[PDB]
């Protein structure tokens, strides 16, 4: 194909403050959303039906992540803690304490026996899911950490920070394997095959790097991104796209190889801070900040 057919199907309302992140369940079943109103909300992925609300954090939440088996959720909050929840009961299974400032990002590893976290304390922390104990505290960066992500088999961690660096660490030892160096790097994540790394910088630019070689392979422009840490995604179910939010209330979709903008989705009324792609269907979830506070589902 040359251009996708993304049309709006549902607009989800419920959050009373700005939404911070939206993540599809690995089983393609649910969509989890986190808000600055200290709440997580679970919605149906294909009908948008509100299913439940998860509460417990004392301050706003910046990120959510699912277990691989779609049974657990992890939450990073301003209350300096992460929280592991059982999605079905909604009860908090564990509280990860250790960071000394706002926890900004979190993610499970594929095994979902470890959790990686970044925080305003400029460190990356690796926690054991079973016990909730902190296994490792890597002095990751010199400034707030914007994103943390495991690779395809969980052997690597990638981290980004406002200090302008991206860093690949060996999970088993915690040692820094690679550093690419400066505008603030606001987002980072591995490609599906684990060979590439997508990094967004606060100069309205995305870059697909091959960290093996330490070389920038693609550059995506046209959108607006200078202030907020906006999520980006590889869209793999249909055509191979790069999807992102933007500070001009648009959802940008580039063709990965051509890097040309293939679509700009209109609807949100504020900065689209988070986007997520469905694991099996051509479904995109977008979330925006206050003045909007809604989640929009798009199908192609």
């Amino acid at each position: 194909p040359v251009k996708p057919n993304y049309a709006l199907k549902f607009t989800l309302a419920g959050h009373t403050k700005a939404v911070s992140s939206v993540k599809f369940s690995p089983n393609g079943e649910w969509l989890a959303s986190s808000s600055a109103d200290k709440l997580i909300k679970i919605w149906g992925a294909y009908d948008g039906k509100f299913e439940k609300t998860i509460s417990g954090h004392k301050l706003g939440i910046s990120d959510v992540a699912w277990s691989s088996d779609s049974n657990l959720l992890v939450s990073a909050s301003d209350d300096k803690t992460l929280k592991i929840w059982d999605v079905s009961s909604g009860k908090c299974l564990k509280t990860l304490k250790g960071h000394s400032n706002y926890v900004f990002c979190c993610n499970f590893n594929p095994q979902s026996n470890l959790i990686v976290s970044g925080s305003f304390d400029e460190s990356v922390r690796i926690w054991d899911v079973k016990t909730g104990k902190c296994l490792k505290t890597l002095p990751a960066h010199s400034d707030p950490v914007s994103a943390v992500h495991f690779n395809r088999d969980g052997s690597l961690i990638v981290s980004s920070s406002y200090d302008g660096l991206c860093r690949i660490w060996d999970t088993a030892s915690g040692q820094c394997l690679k550093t690419l160096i400066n505008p603030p790097v606001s987002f980072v994540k591995f490609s599906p095959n684990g060979k590439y790394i997508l990094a967004a910088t606060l100069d309205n630019t995305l870059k697909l790097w091959d960290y093996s070689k330490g070389k920038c392979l693609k550059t995506y422009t046209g959108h607006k991104n200078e202030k907020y840490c906006i999520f980006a995604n590889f869209s793999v179910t249909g055509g191979k796209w790069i999807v992102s939010g933007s500070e001009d209330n648009l959802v940008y979709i580039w063709n990965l190889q051509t890097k040309e903008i293939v679509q700009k989705l209109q609807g949100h009324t504020d900065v689209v801070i988070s986007t997520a792609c469905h694991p099996t269907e051509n479904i995109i979830a977008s979330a925006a900040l206050e003045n909007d506070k809604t989640i929009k589902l798009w199908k192609s």
């Binding site: 600055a36 706003g60 603030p184």
Partner: peptide
């Protein structure tokens, strides 16, 4: 903190 401009407003 992801929904704020704290670092940019400094």
């Amino acid at each position: 903190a992801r929904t704020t401009s704290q670092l940019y407003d400094a």
